[PDB]
Paper text:
Using the trimeric β-propeller Ralstonia solanacearum lectin (RSL) as a scaffold, we generated a series of mutants with extended and dynamic N-termini. RSL is a C3-symmetric homotrimer with a six-bladed β-propeller fold and two sugar binding sites per monomer. The three N-termini are located in close proximity at the narrow end, and are typically disordered in crystal structures. Specifically, we show that the rigid, bowl-shaped sulfonato-calixarene (sclx4) captures cationic N-terminal motifs, resulting in ordered structures.
While one Met-Lys motif is disordered, clear electron density is evident for the other two N-termini which are bound by calixarenes. Surprisingly, sclx4 encapsulates Met0 instead of Lys1. Similar interactions occur at the two bound N-termini, with the Met0 side chain trapped in the calixarene cavity and the N-terminal ammonium forming a salt-bridge to a sulfonate. Met0 forms CH−π bonds with two or more of the phenol-sulfonates as evidenced by a Cε···centroid distance of 3.7 Å. In addition, a weak hydrogen bond between Met0 (C=O) and Ser2 (NH) may contribute to stabilizing the structure. The 1H–15N HSQC spectrum of 15N-lysine-labeled MK-RSL has a weak signal for Lys1. The fast-exchanging component was further upfield shifted at 4 eq sclx4 (data not shown). These two signals likely correspond to two different forms, for example, sclx4 binding at either Met0 or Lys1.
Residue numbers in the entry:
A (entry chain A), C (entry chain B): 0 to 90
B (entry chain C): 2 to 90
Write the structure that this text describes.
Amino acid sequence: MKSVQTAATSWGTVPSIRVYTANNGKITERCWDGKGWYTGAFNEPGDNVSVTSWLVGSAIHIRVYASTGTTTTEWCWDGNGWTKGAYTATN
Amino acid sequence: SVQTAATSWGTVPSIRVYTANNGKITERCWDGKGWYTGAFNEPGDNVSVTSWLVGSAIHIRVYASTGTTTTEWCWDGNGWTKGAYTATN
Amino acid sequence: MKSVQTAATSWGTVPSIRVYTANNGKITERCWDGKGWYTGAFNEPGDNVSVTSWLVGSAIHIRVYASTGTTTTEWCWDGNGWTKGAYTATN
Ligand SMILES: O=S(=O)(O)c1cc2c(O)c(c1)Cc1cc(S(=O)(=O)O)cc(c1O)Cc1cc(S(=O)(=O)O)cc(c1O)Cc1cc(S(=O)(=O)O)cc(c1O)C2
Ligand SMILES: O=S(=O)(O)c1cc2c(O)c(c1)Cc1cc(S(=O)(=O)O)cc(c1O)Cc1cc(S(=O)(=O)O)cc(c1O)Cc1cc(S(=O)(=O)O)cc(c1O)C2
Ligand SMILES: OC[C@@]1(O)OC[C@@H](O)[C@@H](O)[C@@H]1O
Ligand SMILES: OC[C@@]1(O)OC[C@@H](O)[C@@H](O)[C@@H]1O
Ligand SMILES: OC[C@@]1(O)OC[C@@H](O)[C@@H](O)[C@@H]1O
Ligand SMILES: OC[C@@]1(O)OC[C@@H](O)[C@@H](O)[C@@H]1O
Ligand SMILES: OC[C@@]1(O)OC[C@@H](O)[C@@H](O)[C@@H]1O
Ligand SMILES: OC[C@@]1(O)OC[C@@H](O)[C@@H](O)[C@@H]1O
């Protein structure tokens, strides 16, 4: 059968983990911070997902790259919910 | 085509590359002195990976998916164990 | 049709980000260093892509794993152009 496609990132020593799953054109998010998996706020269209994250001090910044067709949309976590980023590409 | 995921740690570095091929995920390893085959071998058509250090100790999480079922595999120094991850796909 | 596939890595606190996109058998690269996205030098064949990177001091090292069929080629950025690495697999 058609397999879902995942992307994962982690930070710190607890750690926090975020796993994004593209399934039937939608990306959803599962989260771990030491005490059970739960569903996160991220829910956006995409057949394909990649993720990277970095710390600035103790503040986490996450970038999720969601692709449908040739269009990749960047989604940004910087402490004020998810926001659409400036990323563009000419695919 | 086959599908891969990669993680690395330290400054040597160590690198681990996971490849999903014909329903199986295998692992190739670099620790500064050449590539060799690792112990990870579990079913999956899709793979992602993340890893983190606790001091000098590496912890690796491999997300192996077949259909809508994703199984998390955990390296914490004592072989690969199944993790608690679930998702409602 | 089938969506493009991406992989992403980041480093430092600016940060720098690199996003690799596999589109109709070719992988290209977009770059962020804090002041706008631009096109990078990576351009190699591939249907599937993953990436990892690490810092040695302030110097970035990037490894891109590009797959076509059962052949995965590692491409290495060590400051001086993209070169084929020693990665092999028996797929
Ligand atoms: O248990 S099995 O994995 O062997 C299985 C095989 C087939 C099946 O029809 C089912 C199970 C029942 C079934 C289960 C589910 S689930 O609830 O998600 O587990 C879903 C379906 C289903 O038929 C519906 C379905 C989904 C997809 S997908 O879009 O790729 O996920 C494909 C199909 C589905 O029927 C077609 C299909 C493909 C395949 S194959 O594995 O690709 O050869 C086997 C069977 C199929 O019905 C034949
Ligand atoms: O991208 S869309 O899903 O909107 C789309 C679907 C179909 C289409 O016919 C077109 C677009 C028009 C079209 C666009 C392009 S493009 O400008 O390059 O994007 C190319 C084609 C095309 O018909 C030609 C074409 C190429 C290929 S490929 O060489 O293998 O990539 C396959 C096909 C093509 O028509 C067959 C095909 C496959 C599919 S599939 O369901 O995605 O497999 C849908 C449609 C198809 O015509 C049916
Ligand atoms: O604590 C969970 C959460 O806030 O963590 C940061 C992001 O992963 C969000 O989508 C998510 O809801
Ligand atoms: O704060 C958001 C932002 O500026 O962060 C850096 C890059 O990810 C940009 O594309 C993005 O718009
Ligand atoms: O041999 C190196 C090894 O022990 O490194 C840690 C994990 O990547 C293991 O699967 C692997 O076998
Ligand atoms: O020690 C294993 C474990 O607790 O590590 C943190 C998460 O990866 C969990 O899903 C996993 O079961
Ligand atoms: O400054 C841009 C650049 O040199 O950054 C390092 C690599 O990502 C290169 O492919 C890219 O062209
Ligand atoms: O200096 C290049 C190199 O040695 O870097 C570490 C690994 O990526 C190797 O496959 C690669 O050939």
